[PDB]
Amino acid sequence: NITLILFLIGILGFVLNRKNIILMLISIEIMLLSITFLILLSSLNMDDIIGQTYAIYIIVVAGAESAIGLGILVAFYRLRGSIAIEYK
Amino acid sequence: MIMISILSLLLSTSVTLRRDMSILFNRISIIALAYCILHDTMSLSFISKGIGLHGGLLHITNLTQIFHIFIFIISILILQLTSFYPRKVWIPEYSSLKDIFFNKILYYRTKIINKMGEHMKIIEYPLILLFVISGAVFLISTNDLVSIFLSIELQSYGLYLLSTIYRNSELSTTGGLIYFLLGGLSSCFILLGTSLLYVNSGTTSLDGLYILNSISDVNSWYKPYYLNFSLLIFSIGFLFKVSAAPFHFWSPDVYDAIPTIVTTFVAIIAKISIFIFLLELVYYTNSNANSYLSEFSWTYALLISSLLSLIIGTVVGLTQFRIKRLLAYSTISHVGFILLALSVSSIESTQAFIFYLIQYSISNLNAFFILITIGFSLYGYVTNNKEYKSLLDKNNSPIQLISQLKGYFYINPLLSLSLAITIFSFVGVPPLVGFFAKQMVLSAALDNGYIFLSLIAIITSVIGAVYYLNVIKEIFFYSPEHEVNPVLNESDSNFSLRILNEKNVLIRSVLLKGRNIFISSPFSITISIITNVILLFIFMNKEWLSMGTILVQILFSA
Amino acid sequence: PKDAVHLGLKGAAVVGGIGLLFAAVRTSLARKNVGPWAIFTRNGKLAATFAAVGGAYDFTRAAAANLREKEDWVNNGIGGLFAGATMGLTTGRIPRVLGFAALTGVVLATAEYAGSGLRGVFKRDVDEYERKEFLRKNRRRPIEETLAEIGEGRGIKPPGYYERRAQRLKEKYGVDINPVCADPDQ
Amino acid sequence: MSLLYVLLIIPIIGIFLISTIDSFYFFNVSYYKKIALITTILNLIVSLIIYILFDFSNNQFQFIQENLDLSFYDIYLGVDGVSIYFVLLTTIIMPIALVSNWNSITNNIKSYLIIMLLLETLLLAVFLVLDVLLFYIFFESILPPLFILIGLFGSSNKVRASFYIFLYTLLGSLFLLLSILTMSSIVGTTYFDVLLKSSFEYTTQLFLFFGIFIAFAVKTPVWGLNSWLLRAHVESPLGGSIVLAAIVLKLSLYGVFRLILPILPQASLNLTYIVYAIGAITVLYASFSTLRTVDVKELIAYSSVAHAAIYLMGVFSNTIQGLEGAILLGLAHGFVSSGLFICAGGILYDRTGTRLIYFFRGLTQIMPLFSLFFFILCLGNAGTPLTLNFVGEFMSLYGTLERLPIAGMLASTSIIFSAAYSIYMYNRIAFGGSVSLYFIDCFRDLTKREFFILFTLVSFTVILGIYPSFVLDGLHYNISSVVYGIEPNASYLT
Amino acid sequence: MVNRILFWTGFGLAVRFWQLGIEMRPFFNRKSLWAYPLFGGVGASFGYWLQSIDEKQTKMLEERKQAILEKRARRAQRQAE
């Protein structure tokens, strides 16, 4: 149940965010966290080590994504000069 | 082989910062992909729906192997843009076998060949492309839920880095940034899709879920509602990546923002790999008996998407003045035809789906090559249009507008006819290959009762034929806004070329002008072959069509 | 017999509910602060047309069915015909009402006569090989089947056309057919 | 090798010959027209050899070639009674079309000659292919060469015209394509011999009839769908206009002899009252408007819409007289329509730069030869006897009347109304005063080129008007096969 | 008439033609004439290869069509029981 609540925070914090792209990239990190939590909680209920193994591989690719994101964000900032997302 | 090629290329790349090596690192990557072809060719002597490999995590199918080889050829053809210089100098005095193999031609080529161009100076470019191929091919072979997620990421992350590898372009950084962000949203849907499958079923095997699904097909406590709507969320994450509507908005912007040699590979490979992966899923999840599960099939998203991709792709393309925004909307209308064939699951529609995907991938690649070549031909041409002076990143996208092509049939007629044939093949005009592709998907849909989607598609095509004809109308009906460069053709400025023999001895010195500067052969030969395949498909259709007849028979047999 | 007035509200709640979120998306993309209660301030009309078009499609579609008690493709055409005619009334222009009634009217006749595959298609449940084989080699058909189809005459003059034609004319005009002997002899 | 494949390849040699001479001999643009002209004469010779060998009383398709190499889309060629005169007409017209633009084409002469030579290969293949998928492959393949031809050599509003010819044809054909594809999924093939002997359910025939009729009503063209013709037949270059009104218009009429009559018998017999309503309304409306037309080329173009209805009603008459006269009408229409475009689009527009009839009056004072031929051509357009146009109209109208009296009668108004616009055009241009006073420069009469392309065209319509047995003789046996019905005392003889 | 070998020989010749046209280089330049046997020879080499894979595709569908009939023929046999 905290799995849905966390997943909805990260989805709206990605789509309803009007501040900056690091907060965009943070909200992806929240969604993946909630999904990993759902997988970790199910795996304990079903006596499965595969779910914890699946969780660990979503942590490793979630860090790979956030490094590729921060690298792309720097490239964009060097040229644009603001990573602020502009409304009106 | 692809993994040995990445590691070996990475070790050589990691001990050099010489930008002059980029051309030779691209030439070695084409050699590497040719070994992968020789290996997947040897692996083709078995008839099987699928063989589990590596502890069940991966699988091999005749369909899985024919598709890796196709990805490898397409990659070799796209890799040619960064492997050979765009332009060339050709004289009849250097045109025989003894000339090519035993003589040398010295001249100042730095400006003529654009030796120091951006496409020729990114050392890691072939390497990031090989990683995307590594991810693409692994996804076609994925047999587990966890394998799917890692493979789509390895494909997606490399497409984000390729979209951003031009780091001094504000247009690529922006296109890269949009693509990474919205694709990360796309992957969070894919992860939720897989996560709900393992949580309700206790298994990560696709082979186990297909078994649970087939038992549940009968005709009270655990109705398998999860399979169809876990697969729905999983499916939306893949409709973003193939840029099927209504998840298409990013692709016109990203494809228009990134450089054109890059948009060639990024707009073609993801579709081949993702569509082949979805094909096996759609076959093994279809309830032959009508049932409560059938009422909720995850494949209705594909029909809804194909419906929307037809209307959206052709209509929004009507008022596009940018050639890359036009090419992307043309793709969204073609993925509607692909989706329609993928959603009707039948022998005839699987043959049609397989034929359409290969032909569109070779045709969309011809369109990109002609476009790239046309903007390398404008080197000895000059213009005085304010709009063509107000464009941005003209080095990364030489041709940005449809109007930039006005009168191209008077500058180079055969390259303009090649683009006409390719565009007419997108329309679906006989006897070109694109007509036959469209007809095969219409025949399958008409046979299976999808009469309404067939009617949408035919009305949609006439709408999309409008903007295809505005492109041709631009090529053929007006006069060029481009003029021969007055100083490159002035009869007073000529560079000296000098022809030596096998051992550093001069034979003949030549004085050459701008009329002695032509497209390099690897691009004109590539455009020539695909044009003629498209043109003469009716006399050469037997082996290609039979290859798809047999693959469908293996998938639907037993 | 179906409760059209009860049905149509259900039809309005479904379609009108979709326009509610499209209204909410419009409020979110607004560049000026108006407040949360703006959903019914300016965006109310968008959901109202979604509300109006929906139930107006259902009541008329239902009311058509209750008028003659038969379920077929055409009923959805009438309801679609009205739903489009309702779309124009928001704009207030006769061509739009007719241009709209024509469009969504024909769309919802076509997908109902053809069975739009958005909810699957009819299952074969039979030998597909046999069905194609039968439709292809039934090359001769009994003369009755064509006569029921195209009638008789207009060049379809079968053996016995003249014997029956004389009787048919007699029962209608009361004239005995007897062509003239047309010969001095015999 | 089949003579039929000889017909399809000689224009390809011409294209290859034309494009490589510049690599051999600044070659003069005169040479490429010499090659293009000779290449069409060779096709005419071969088609004339085929007619001298053709047998007029054989059901089997003639001049077929063994293949034994079956692929998914092979190309089969055949010549029977109905299709041979259409092939004969195409190989007669094409030399005249090139001669009609011998001087009018200035830029892109290579492009114009290559399109027309390509255009000839594609048009013959339509009347020669032996299955319905092949029929569609070649009936839609003409669109790209016609699109580029119009917008490269056309009049001022060529862009609008090129978009109209491409988007109406494509749409109608797609409705045709959905019908051809349904047939192939039922029969398992499209080959004429296999497909003809298949029957169809009545409902199938009705839905198969539509789509095909949507397609042929666009390409006829019937009134209300005819706006592409007024644009693309006027703005086209004269040679393209000749091909578009003598050959392309007649593919749909021939497509009734392969796609509607033998495989949809019940459907046609019950839907004729729709077709005759459309056909009579077409005759009636397409005559009144062409009475008020100011563009001289548009008046000639839109009279074709008037005549194409008469032979469209003759092919749905289920009468051996109507079907034959319909072919004769579409054969004669090719000669007279070709000449009238030459007269208007080639002789007036070349001299004056305009096509507004306001500027023309009393040319008989200055152009005696042009007035002569422009009067026989106007009589043929009016179906005056001694002209094959008359025999085709008379035989089609009897068939139309015999099938549906009220429709044939409402078609029979064409005798009154075709003479109305054909002579009103003649007296405004040739007669009606001394000369138009907007001519600030006197006009030369017909040149020898003009005098000979018209002399041929009126020769064919007249000779076949005194002796139409030249065409009628080879048409009889094969067109007997496309009738539907039986007599009580002659059916099921034992 | 379409010989799998003669077509692909002709196909290779047309690639060289279309190449030179796109490149805007003169057709039938004398010192470069060798490219027509070479492009033409490669096309024939492809045609020999296609001919072989065509033989292999005829068999596989020939086996399949037999396998379909046999699957169908024994299915109705049990129905008559």
TrEMBL record, chain A:
Transmembrane stretches, start-end: 20-42, 54-79
MF terms in GO: NADH dehydrogenase (ubiquinone) activity; oxidoreductase activity, acting on NAD(P)H
GO cellular component: mitochondrial inner membrane; NADH dehydrogenase complex
Chief place of localization: mitochondrion
Family matches, as Pfam families: Oxidored_q2
Catalytic activity: a ubiquinone + NADH + 5 H(+)(in) = a ubiquinol + NAD(+) + 4 H(+)(out)
EC number(s) from the headed UniProt entry: 7.1.1.2
One of the GO biological process terms: ATP synthesis coupled electron transport
Compartments, as annotated in UniProt: Mitochondrion inner membrane; Mitochondrion membrane
Bilayer topology: Multi-pass membrane protein
Swiss-Prot/TrEMBL keywords: Electron transport, Membrane, Mitochondrion, Mitochondrion inner membrane, NAD, Respiratory chain, Translocase, Transmembrane, Transmembrane helix, Transport, Ubiquinone
Family: Belongs to the complex I subunit 4L family.
Function of the molecule: Core subunit of the mitochondrial membrane respiratory chain NADH dehydrogenase (Complex I) which catalyzes electron transfer from NADH through the respiratory chain, using ubiquinone as an electron acceptor.
Protein name per its UniProtKB record: NADH-ubiquinone oxidoreductase chain 4L
UniProtKB/TrEMBL annotation, chain C:
InterPro entries: NDUFA11
Positions of transmembrane segments: 4-25
Membrane topology of this protein: Multi-pass membrane protein
Biological-process GO terms, alphabetical: mitochondrial electron transport, NADH to ubiquinone
Origin superkingdom: Eukaryota
UniProt keyword Membrane, yes or no: yes
Record-level GO cellular component terms: mitochondrial inner membrane; respiratory chain complex I
Compartments in which it is found: Mitochondrion inner membrane
Keywords recorded for this protein, A-Z: Membrane, Mitochondrion, Mitochondrion inner membrane, Transmembrane, Transmembrane helix, Ubiquinone
PANTHER family linked to this entry: NADH DEHYDROGENASE [UBIQUINONE] 1 ALPHA SUBCOMPLEX SUBUNIT 11, NADH-UBIQUINONE OXIDOREDUCTASE SUBUNIT
Protein name: NADH-ubiquinone oxidoreductase-like protein
Organism encoding this protein: Chaetomium thermophilum (strain DSM 1495 / CBS 144.50 / IMI 039719) (Thermochaetoides thermophila)
From TrEMBL, chain D:
Keywords linked to the UniProt accession: Electron transport, Membrane, Mitochondrion, NAD, Respiratory chain, Transmembrane, Transmembrane helix, Transport, Ubiquinone
Principal location class: membrane
Membrane topology classification: Multi-pass membrane protein
Pfam families given in the database record: Proton_antipo_M (PF00361)
Superkingdom, natural source: Eukaryota
Cell compartment(s), UniProt: Membrane; Mitochondrion membrane
The EC number(s) this enzyme carries: 7.1.1.2
Membrane-crossing residue ranges in chain numbering: 6-25, 35-54, 74-99, 111-129, 135-153, 165-187, 207-230, 242-261, 267-287, 299-320, 326-349, 369-392, 404-424, 451-470
Family: Belongs to the complex I subunit 4 family.
NCBIfam families in the cross-refs: NDH_I_M (TIGR01972)
Name this protein carries in UniProt: NADH-ubiquinone oxidoreductase chain 4
Automatic annotation (TrEMBL), chain E:
Ranges that cross the membrane: 33-50
Top-rank taxon, per record: Eukaryota
Keywords in alphabetical order: Membrane, Transmembrane, Transmembrane helix
Protein's UniProt name: Uncharacterized protein
